Each structure stands twice: as C-alpha cells, then as structure tokens.
C-alpha cells in the first residue's frame, strides 16, 4: 500500500510453468523437423533455378528474419557465398528495396560489398532522390540496411538521415498506410540493432499480414518459435528456483529480488537458440552474482569495508568469510559457490580449466567497482576519458559478459579465445562503450547528478566546458563509432570464429533494446518485451 | 550497468536547492498579496452586480481551478452560499456548460442541489440528447461535474457514460480541435479526482491558451504557484536531509532509500498550501518509517521474529531494542525516535498529547502487517471480505494517514476528532477501500499472483467462482461506491469540520493519481508528475 516499494509484476508465473510431457514434446519436435526439410527442399529448388535472383534473396531474408536461419545456417552461408561470387548476379538492375537487401545480406555475412550500388539512387546533388519517398517499401529497406554501416560508409550515414526524414513523414501524413506498423517499429528499433529473438517475434506478426507471404515459411517460423519458447520457459522455471534460493540466504532482500525475468531477458540477448542452454545458465547466474556484489559497493559501508571486500575477492577463498563484516558474507559466499558450480558443470566435458578466465573477470569487476567507490569517497572528479578508461567501461559488465558467454560454448571457445578476450580487445571495449554511454546518457539529466559520483555526461561537461545537449551529441558520436567498430568486426576475415564474434554483436544489440532512452530496468517497456517472447505461444 | 537495480532519477537535485534571500522572498510575497487584493476587489465587483450570474460563476470557478481559492476561502464560500440562497439565480436558462458549472460548484461546497437541473438536456428516451455532442465545451463540463456524484445520482452515472463516449469521439475524429489537450487530459484525470496542486498547474497552462482569459487571474495563479513552489522546495530540501540521515543508519539499503521525491509527492496530496508545513513534515516522516517497517514484514524472516517485532511495537519502548534481532533494531528505533520528535514539535503549542493517537495507528499497522504475513506462512487463503476486513483495508495506510494528517492541523483537530478517526468511521474506510482496491487491481494479473499471498482480485475470483474480468468489474463497483461515500462526506451538514474532511477527500484524490493503471510507484509517470510541480517555476 502506501510506502510499498516492492513491485512484483510477475509473481510466481514462471515458477508455475508446467512443461508438456515427453511424447508431446517429441511430436512437436518432429513436426518442426518435417517443415524444416520442406523449407530446405524449396531452398535447393531456388538455388539451381537459372534466373530468379530476387526470389532467392527474399527467401533467404525471410527465413533469417523469421528467426529460423539457425536451423539452416550452413545452407544459407554457402548460398550467400555463391551470390558474392556470382559477378553477373544482376544487382545493377534491382530497385531500392532489393539493392538494399542484397547489400545488407552480403554485409551481414562478412562480405565487404561496396556502397557504389546505391549510386543510381542519387541525384545531381549527390543526395538520394526525394522522388523515391513514394516507394515506402524501398525506403524502409534502405533504412534497415544503413545500420550495418562501418567507417567509410558515408553513403549509409546520409542514407539514414534521408530515410529517417521520409519515414517519419510516412508515419505523420499516411497514418493508414499498410506499412505504418512496420515503419513505426523500425523507427523505434532497426532490425539489425535489435534482439534477434524479439525482432523475429515481431517479424512473424508482420509477415502474416503480407498478402504474398509463403505459408510454409510462416508455419516454420511459428512452430519453431513455440518449440524454442518451451525450452526458454523450462530454463527460466529452473533458474528462478536457483535465484530464489540465493535470495533466501539473506534476511533483508537484495534489490535484485524478483528480477529473474529481467535478468533472463538480458540473458536471451547473446543467444536464444536451443544449443546455448549452458551459456544462458552461466550468464544468468553471473548476472545475479554481479548484482549481489554491486549491492555491496552501492551500500553505505565504509571505504575500509570495501577495501577488505575487494582484497578478499582477489584472494577468492572461503577463509575470507570469517574476516568480512556480516552483511558481506552472503555475497562473498555466492561468488565462491557459483563459480565452483561452473567448474562442476564443465567437468564432464573436460573444460573446468576455463572457469579461471571468468573468475578473473569477476575480480576485475570488483576492482573497477572499488575504483568507482574510491573516486566517490575521496571526492575525486575524473575527466570523461579517465572515468571511462579506468573503471566505467569495464564496470558496465561486458568484459565479464563476453568471457562468460564463451564459458558455455564448448570446443569452439579455445583457450586462445579466452586469452584474446582477457586482453581487452577493441571490440569488447566497443560493446562496453555502447553499454556504458547509453546507461549514463539515459540515467539522469545534469541537474539530477549525485555530488562526487562520476558519470559520463557530467564528466564530459566539466572536462570540455560544453552544455548537456553538446555532451550528449558528442557521446552519441562515440556510441555510433563503436557501432561501426562492431559492424567491421563482422567483416571477413574474422578475428575470432564467427560464433564468438556473434555473442559480442548480440551483447551490443540487447543493450540497444534495454537502454532505449528518449527508463532502463523493470519498467513498462521491459514488461512488454518480456510478454512478447515469454508468455503465450503464437496461435496456430 | 548490467544488473544495476539502483535507479536514481533525481540524485541530489532537491538537496542542492538554494533558497532566495529573505528580502527577496518578502518582495515576492508582497507582489502576490497585491494582486490578491486586485482579485478580491474584482470579485466584490462581480458580487454587487445585478443579473450577471455567469460572470461570477466563471470567476469563482477559475480562481479555484488556478489553485488560489485558498487565498479567498471565506470570500468564496460566502458567495457560493449566497448563490444557493438566491433561488432566482437564473439556472433554468443556462446552457450545458454553465448548468454543469453551477451544479458542480454547489456540490463541491456541500449544497445538495438536485440532478433535475439536467432534465432539459434529455430527450424523450430519458437519455442525454446526442445532438449536444457538438457542444464540446458543454460535454466536457458535464463530464467534470459527473464525478461529484453520490448515491441517488443516476443522472450523473448516465452522464459519465454519455460524455465519455462523445469526448473519446472528439479525440479520435477531431484531433486538431482546440479543446483536444483539455479533453485528453480530462479523460485521463477528472479535475475533481485529481491532486489539487498538480491539476491547478495543468489548468494554469490551459487557461493561458484561452483567448478570453483574465490576465490578472492568470498572473495571480502563476505568481502564487511560484511562491508556494519555493516553500515546497525548501521543505523537501530539509526532509531529504532527514530521510538521508535515517537511511545511513543501515548498512544495506532499504527499497525506499532514494524515494524522498515520490514520498513528498504523496505528501503534497492531502495539503499543498503554506499553512500545512508541519502536516507535510509529519506525513512524510511517517511515510518513511512506515516504509521501513513494511520492509521488515516483507523480508525473509521467520514468523517467530515477526511475532516478536509486532509484540515489541505493542510495547513501544526502547527496552525492546535489546530483545529484537539485529536487522530489526534500526527500524524499531526509527519508530520510537520519530514519534518522540513529533512530541517535541507539538510541545510549544501544547499538543504533545495527540501523538498518542498516531502511535496507536502505527501499532495497528504492525498488527495488520503481521496478519498478512501470518496468512502467507500458514498457507491460508482468505475470503475477499475477510482479506479486506481483517488486514488489507487498514494496511493500505489511511487510518494511519488520516490520523497523521490531523496531527499537524492545530486547534481544529480536537481530541474528539482524533477519537472519531480512531474508531474507523465509514469515510476513512472508504478512502482505504479506494486505496487498497486500486493498488491490488493494478499490481498484477491473476496468472502473475504470488502463491499464498492474498490479493483482492485473486481472493474475489476464488471466493465467488468468477473470472478475472468479472472480479475486476465488481471490485471497480466497490471503488465507485466508496467514491460516492466520499462525495457524500462533503455534503452539509458536515460530520467533522470541513478542513478535516478535506484531508480525507485529498487522500482519495492522490490515490486516484498515483494508481492510475490502464502503474505504480517510481515510474515515468510519477517522475513527470514530480517534474510538473517541483522543478522549474512557471515562466513570466
């Protein structure tokens, strides 16, 4: 009632999930496999067809945006490779939508195809023809393709401005145009920058409204979505039990109590496909443990108590439990226990040796937390570049996030990849810059800062002597440059194996979804995003 | 960053408030007092004028909705009384807007005028003429008047359905109509049911856009608003200091740690005018201690520890500090300390004897909290009427709230009034029913309930064997009937003096504003509502 600050939007809904029995689950599995083989047969048909470039382009695009391209991964990559090798594929004669589709697909699969294919859509000024604004479909396609841009894609930089202006006008002057639901959604969330699972859920609904949609592809996307959603909800029921058990170790509740759905929503970002259950188990659990130690560093304890907790984290041993103040013991024990559990989970595969790399990242998290605490306790005001480089990029959590993602991926995560991520590569820093800058820009305005608690916008304002609007614009430029670094990371040849780079790309995407500021955690948008992918199956 | 559940939308903004110097504040005070005398002279002019009902009606309505009728309280009441006695006022000839204005104004001032005044607006069917929908202004006025309805006002019940239908059509078919902002706002928040401070702010903005507005009235409202806002910001600076000092007693943060702005918003509901500073101090402080003890009963402690805390609260003595478990001691001490501070604040006027009644309500709160905890641990499923009568109406906080409101009101709040409120009168029960039922209806849906945690919708569903929609509708009817009891409370002859009933009416209004689900504490709507009345002055 009054003074009640205990929101429980979800209650026991996820704990009360009842999975269907094994006979049923295997029946649904075989149904979806039957339609998968149907899709693959039709795909083979389109590949050997003599002309017909656009049909194969659209078929590939639809299976990808329906969220079932993972069930056809190899088949698609080969096909796109063939398209890239066909130097007489006919791109010169495509309209805006299909030129944009060819460009976007090729860029997303690592092929560094040129922006010159867009030249025929420019006028004498060197700008895109405003006459193209009547081709709503093609403007939408160009808008979506422009978000794969890297450094040196000035055409795509201007294409984003051009398409944004015309798409906003479509929303405003043509409210009843058949594409307005899609245009409005894309303006809020470009597909390439959204969470794969959630954007595929929305595209399934859009695709059903397309009069020319392929019925078997729509059925494939719906059936696989419901199959994969049952796996998610079984995982979330179990992980809810584990999280609740951890919460009941303390007498007073942690802030993260009842926040398993939000944490698991986060966890679905890097990976939603069935084969990453172990990945999702690790990411969720580290998420909870991180939240718990974050509570320690955000409380009203002394800087000596925070020093002791950081040192004890560096030693990483239960002997430290007797030396720590009472209120820190549950969090410290959870650190030791959870990573021991990771070791047990990886022993049958002979992979326990890797837990070490995640443990070090966790120790790093404590160190940067300590630094942030220190800056506040000793009333030091860093510059923006100092705030980022010394604590805040890493304290966002993606140096730990990337290593924990690799933790569950099996033989592809070699020791060499763990050491690569441990050395703070440029792309992991980019993911962290995106997250940290969006979190800080959206958290509060300048006049709502906390004295002596550094933040990116306040640090930029005090360092460069500019106003809030300017600081927001320059930091937004840093976010955009980091996004271009991420898109260059997906261009061949790959630094690390693609399954590993894709985790970092997805970490950036889930941040674009959660920190859509213009709230951050546990608000109405988060509740609706969870409702979209984790409550009911898709009808029929 | 990731796993960060520490939102601080406001930071140190209210702590860093800098008041103006005493000479400046006295200057602004004298300016507003001068324009008050101007307004009063003009009002005297309108009263001593033959056959000008509509000009005087509108003048009174505007000074009230500008939020400065408290500077003319007696002068306005007398005038309205004179209007009720006229009997030749000419109401028989008013159009829809002015008939609605006359009816609403008289009802709000205790005069039980009849619904028959609306007979000329009905057709042969006995329903309001749909032809009236073209009089947007009059439809809006009738909509606003209909929320003062009591038992036996079937005309107003039909008026709400009629005007809602047509106002919704104006919003959808006439988006650019000049009244669309006002209609959209009224459809979300009826004036009569809103928080006076916040609704007067919105009306100040609306009134400036009326080409026929009185420039001096607008200046009166703007200047008084900025003057009273300086008082609120000084009070909130001080109370933020007190609240932060209390919070630093605990090592781990309470859920209510950074929630002074939301709590003070709550506190402005019952009273916003300068004379209730002490009231606001008490309500806010009680709010905070209530939140602290609510945390104890919501934590994962044993039913034996909650038994002990409840018994210790019944004893109300610092000696219990030695008997309680550690994590309860700061909460218990805050109880003892805060109510002692109330004794000190009321000693100079010789009223410390009244703190007793508030202490009793606080003890009742622990009891009803205990009952709710007991039901959960004994896995008991109460009946809906049982859920309400035995814990949940009182646990919303308004038996305590009404007694704490009276605590700061001085000689008007007699010992007899405290004893009237201690005995659970029907109108305090109505306020609690409104609060509890809106909170429970909006908190979660049926499938998101917590096992063994009673809540109104779930209890009604399991008691009566109905579905969620029906339980929500029947409970909404209970809320509506309680609102009719509240409107009856403001009809003469008054049970208690009017200043005391008005606190109860305002408690219901602040609940209608905060639990506007269509959804709880500390969300973007609460942040915007605080922004509207507590950040910047009104320009010019």
Chain B hits for A2, CB-CB cut-off 8 Å, are 266, 287, 290, 396-398, 401, 435
Distance in angstroms (rounded) separating the CA atoms of residues B151 and B534: 37
Contact of A163 with A139, CB cutoff 8 Å = yes
Which B residues 299-328 touch A at CB under 8 Å? 299-301, 325, 327
> Which one, of B254, B8, B252, B515, lies nearest residue A520 by Cα?
B8
Resolution reading in Å: 2.2
Q: How far is A188 from chain B (nearest CA, A)?
A: 18
> Which one, of A257, A508, A241, A476, lies nearest residue A401 by Cα?
A508
> Which one, of A340, A337, A336, A284, lies nearest residue A313 by Cα?
A336
Which A residues 202-241 touch B at CB under 8 Å? none
Establish how many alpha carbons lie within 13 A of residue B508's alpha carbon, considering only the half-sphere containing its beta carbon. 29
The backbone torsions φ and ψ at residue B355, rounded to the nearest 5 degrees and listed phi first, read -55, -30
> Which one, of A474, A486, A538, A539, lies nearest residue A512 by Cα?
A486
Does the CA dihedral A354-A356-A357-A362 come out positive or negative?
A: positive
- Name the residue of chain A whose CA is nearest to B246's CA: A300
Q: For chain A, what is the radius of gyration of the CA atoms?
A: 24
Which A residues 445-474 touch B at CB under 8 Å? 447-451, 453
- Residue written as token pair 């809106």: B438
Question: Structural domain boundaries of chain B?
Answer: 1-49+213-539, 50-212
Which A residues 504-523 touch B at CB under 8 Å? 519-523
Q: Do B251 and A450 touch (CB under 8 A)?
A: no
- Name the residue of chain B whose CA is nearest to A520's CA: B7
Distance in angstroms (rounded) separating the CA atoms of residues B83 and B89: 7
> Which one, of B404, B384, B381, B380, lies nearest residue B393 by Cα?
B384
Distance in angstroms (rounded) separating the CA atoms of residues A236 and A272: 12
> Which one, of B197, B225, B49, B186, lies nearest residue B530 by Cα?
B197
Burial of B434 (0-12, 13-18, 19+ CB in 10 A): buried
Token code pair at residue A204: 């399934």
Q: Is A448 helix (H, G, I), strand (E, B) or coil?
A: helix
Q: How far is B502 from chain A (nearest CA, A)?
A: 19
Token code pair at residue B117: 């005044």
Burial of B25 (0-12, 13-18, 19+ CB in 10 A): middle
Does the CA dihedral B448-B449-B450-B455 come out positive or negative?
A: positive
Please check whether residue B2 touches A, CB under 8 A. yes
Other CB atoms within 10 Å distance of the CB of residue A187: 16
DSSP secondary structure letter of residue B445: -
DSSP secondary structure letter of residue B538: P
How many residues in total does chain B contain?
540
Other CB atoms within 10 Å distance of the CB of residue B275: 12
Contact of B483 with B157, CB cutoff 8 Å = no
DSSP secondary structure letters along A301-323: --HHHHHHHHHHHHHT-GGGGGT
Q: Do A255 and B259 touch (CB under 8 A)?
A: no
The backbone torsions φ and ψ at residue B95, rounded to the nearest 5 degrees and listed phi first, read -75, -170
Considering only the beta carbons, identify the residue of B251, B298, B436 that sits closest to A6.
Answer: B298
Chain A hits for B335, CB-CB cut-off 8 Å, are none
Which A residues 388-447 touch B at CB under 8 Å? 395-398, 401, 435-436, 439, 443-444, 447
- Name the residue of chain B whose CA is nearest to A287's CA: B3
> Which one, of A453, A474, A321, lies nearest residue A374 by Cα?
A453
Q: How far is A446 from chain B (nearest CA, A)?
A: 9
Q: Do B1 and A448 touch (CB under 8 A)?
A: no
> Which one, of B310, B287, B433, lies nearest residue B368 by Cα?
B310
Under 8 Å CB pairs connecting chains A and B tally to 159
Q: Do A255 and B398 touch (CB under 8 A)?
A: no
**Helices (H), ranges, A49-115:** 53-65, 73-85, 96-108
Chain B hits for A519, CB-CB cut-off 8 Å, are 7, 523-524
Chain mean position to CA A334 = 26
Contact of B538 with B222, CB cutoff 8 Å = yes
Considering only the beta carbons, identify the residue of B252, B291, B443 that sits closest to A327.
Answer: B252
Contact of A482 with A432, CB cutoff 8 Å = no
- Residue written as token pair 């007979």: B119
- Name the residue of chain B whose CA is nearest to A451's CA: B12
Considering only the beta carbons, identify the residue of B6, B397, B523 that sits closest to A2.
Answer: B397
Chain B hits for A263, CB-CB cut-off 8 Å, are 3
Sequence-ordered list of residues with C-beta below 8 angstroms from that of B390, at least 6 positions apart, any chain:
B368, B371, B382
Q: How far is A252 from chain B (nearest CA, A)?
A: 5
Sequence-ordered list of residues with C-beta below 8 angstroms from that of A293, at least 6 positions apart, any chain:
A309, A313, A331, A335, A365, A366, A369
The backbone torsions φ and ψ at residue A128, rounded to the nearest 5 degrees and listed phi first, read -65, 145
Distance in angstroms (rounded) separating the CA atoms of residues B118 and B114: 9
Q: How far is B30 from chain A (nearest CA, A)?
A: 30
Give, in order, the Cα–Cα distances in Å from A486 to each of A266, A483, B374, B508.
19, 5, 54, 53
Chain B hits for A16, CB-CB cut-off 8 Å, are 451
């Amino acid at each position: 009632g009054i003074a009640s600050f205990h929101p429980s939007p979800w209650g026991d809904y996820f704990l009360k999930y009842v999975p269907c029995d094994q006979v049923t689950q295997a029946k649904m599995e075989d149904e979806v496999k039957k339609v998968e083989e149907d899709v693959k047969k039709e795909l083979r048909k389109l590949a050997k067809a003599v002309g017909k470039p656009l049909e194969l382009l659209n078929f590939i695009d639809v299976v990808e945006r329906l969220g079932v391209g993972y069930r056809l991964e190899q088949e698609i990559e080969d096909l796109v490779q063939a398209i890239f090798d066909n130097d007489k594929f006919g791109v010169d004669e495509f309209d805006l939508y299909h030129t944009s589709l060819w460009f976007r697909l090729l860029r997303q699969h690592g092929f560094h195809v040129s922006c010159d294919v867009f030249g025929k859509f420019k006028g004498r000024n060197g700008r895109f023809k405003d006459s193209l604004a009547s081709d709503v479909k093609g403007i939408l396609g160009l808008y979506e393709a422009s978000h794969v841009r890297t450094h040196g894609d000035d055409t795509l930089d201007e294409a984003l401005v051009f398409t944004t202006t015309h798409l906003k006008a479509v929303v405003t002057n043509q409210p009843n145009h058949p594409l307005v639901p899609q245009v409005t959604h894309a303006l809020m969330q470009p597909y390439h920058k959204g969470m794969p699972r959630l954007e595929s859920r929305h595209f399934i609904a859009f695709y059903e409204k397309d009069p020319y949609h392929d019925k078997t592809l729509l059925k494939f996307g719906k059936l696989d979505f419901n199959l994969v959603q049952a796996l998610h909800k079984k995982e979330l029921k179990d992980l809810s039990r584990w999280w609740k058990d951890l919460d009941m170790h303390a007498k007073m509740p942690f802030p993260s109590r009842d926040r398993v759905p939000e944490g698991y929503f986060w966890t679905l970002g890097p990976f939603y496909e069935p084969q990453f259950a172990l990945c999702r188990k690790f990411f969720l659990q580290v998420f909870k443990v991180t939240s718990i130690v974050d509570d320690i560093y955000d409380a009203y304890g002394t800087i000596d108590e925070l020093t002791a907790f950081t040192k004890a984290a560096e030693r990483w041993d239960r002997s430290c439990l007797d030396e720590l103040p009472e209120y820190m013991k549950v969090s410290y024990a959870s650190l030791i226990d959870t990573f021991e559990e990771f070791e047990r989970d990886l022993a049958p595969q002979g992979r326990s040796w890797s837990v070490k790399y995640a443990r070090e990242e966790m120790i790093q998290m404590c160190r940067v937390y300590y630094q942030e605490a220190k800056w506040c306790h000793e009333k030091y005001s860093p510059t923006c570049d100092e705030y980022l480089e010394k604590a805040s990029i890493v304290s966002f959590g993606y140096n730990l996030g990337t290593v924990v993602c690799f933790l569950g991926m099996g033989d592809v995560a070699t020791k060499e990849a763990f050491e690569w991520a441990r050395g703070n590569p440029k792309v992991v820093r980019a993911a962290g810059i995106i997250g940290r800058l969006m979190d800080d820009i959206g958290s509060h305005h300048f006049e709502q800062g906390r004295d002596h608690v550094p933040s990116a916008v306040e640090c930029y304002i005090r360092q460069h002597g500019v106003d809030e609007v300017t600081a927001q614009r320059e930091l937004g430029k840093r976010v955009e440059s980091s996004w271009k670094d991420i898109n260059e990371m997906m261009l061949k040849p790959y630094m690390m194996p693609k399954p590993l780079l894709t985790r970092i790309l997805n970490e950036c995407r889930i941040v674009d979804v959660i920190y859509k500021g213009e709230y951050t955690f546990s608000n109405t948008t988060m509740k609706k995003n969870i409702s979209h992918i984790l409550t009911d199956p898709i009808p029929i």
